[PDB]
From TrEMBL:
UniProt lineage: Bacteria, Bacillati, Bacillota, Bacilli, Lactobacillales
Gene3D superfamilies tied to this protein: 2.70.98.10
GO BP annotations listed: carbohydrate metabolic process
Family annotation (InterPro entries): Aldose_1/G6P_1-epimerase, Gal_mutarotase_sf_dom, GH-type_carb-bd, LacX
Name of this protein: Galactose mutarotase related enzyme
Pfam families for the chain: Aldose_epim
Molecular function (Gene Ontology), one example: carbohydrate binding
Length: 294
């Protein structure tokens, strides 16, 4: 079950399963911006990450003194969303808890995602609502993989991420053991002011989680390639770059994060887990982004 939206410039395909964007096409030349899910490198396209990003310590966590199991990448991506408010250029997907999610995460919730194509590209609005009486801690991320050109030898063809604004040098969360965090924030191999060259040398050591929350726009581009994209992500405190390690995948993921993978060690209380947001009963958090399609 899939839904398409479109306007004069663009078409998008979104799976009801995980409200997962799977395709985003420039109609003028039929260019595909989003990874096609070739299992040679990675069999997904752009999952939603909720209520956890990344891996959990010993695949579990705490709520105060109680322990629960948690799957890597959360579980929203594993269940269908209902479709509503469908027009030619926009659509809304909504997921609630189920008996399975309640075993991992004992909260009633609503996760709503609205996609809309505009002249600029694709707008995405998220609303996370705590439908429980208990205080609900969560993380929310989006994990799109974008097609990129490669050199004769399979290296990335001179792609950089350019960011703005930047009020201090670019920093990343330290990783160890991949893909968990080690707890530090550190300098990034090869960063030059607001420009980060995206190389296998950089990415082979695992995901690069930018710590600079002031960033409003992040552009993935190469001077040798016509198409680029820019992520408008002021609402998302962190931004992660990833490509399959020690492989020559023809994609780079640029992933808005409202949360962080666990710091290595013992299972973490989600009420104090770095990057988590705790919602009061009945409260909601809203986050927006845009993928500008150039
Ligand atoms: Cl070349
Ligand atoms: Cl490279």
């Amino acid at each position: 079950g899939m839904i398409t939206i479109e306007n004069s410039k663009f078409k998008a395909g979104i799976a009801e399963r995980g409200a997962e964007l799977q395709s985003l096409v420039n109609k003028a030349d039929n260019y595909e911006y989003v990874w096609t899910g070739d299992k040679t490198f990675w069999n997904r396209h752009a999952p939603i990450l909720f209520p956890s990003i990344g891996k959990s310590n010993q695949d579990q966590y705490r709520l105060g003194a109680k322990t629960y199991p948690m799957s890597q990448h959360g579980f929203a991506r594993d269940y269908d969303f209902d479709v509503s408010d469908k027009s030619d250029s926009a659509v809304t997907f909504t997921q609630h808890q189920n008996a399975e999610t309640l075993k991992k995460f004992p909260f009633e919730y609503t996760l709503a995602v609205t996609y809309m194509l505009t002249d600029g590209g694709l707008s995405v609005h998220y609303t996370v609502t705590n439908d429980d009486s208990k205080s609900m801690p969560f993380a929310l991320g989006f994990h799109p993989a974008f097609n990129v050109g490669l050199k004769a030898d399979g290296s990335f063809d001179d792609y950089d991420l350019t960011v703005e604004p930047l009020n201090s040098p670019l920093q990343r969360f330290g990783i160890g053991p991949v893909p968990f965090r080690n707890g530090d924030v550190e300098d990034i191999p090869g960063a030059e002011g607001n420009r980060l060259p995206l190389t296998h040398d950089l990415l082979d050591g695992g995901l690069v989680i930018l710590a600079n929350s002031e960033i409003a726009k992040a552009t993935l581009a190469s001077p040798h390639h016509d198409h680029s994209i820019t992520l408008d992500i002021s609402d998302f405190p962190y931004l992660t770059i990833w490509s399959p390690e020690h492989k020559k995948a023809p994609f780079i993921a640029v992933e808005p994060f409202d949360g962080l993978p666990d710091q290595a060690g013992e299972p973490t209380d989600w009420y104090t887990k770095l990057g988590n947001t705790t919602l009061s009963a009945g409260a909601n958090k809203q986050l927006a982004l845009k993928v500008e399609l150039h």
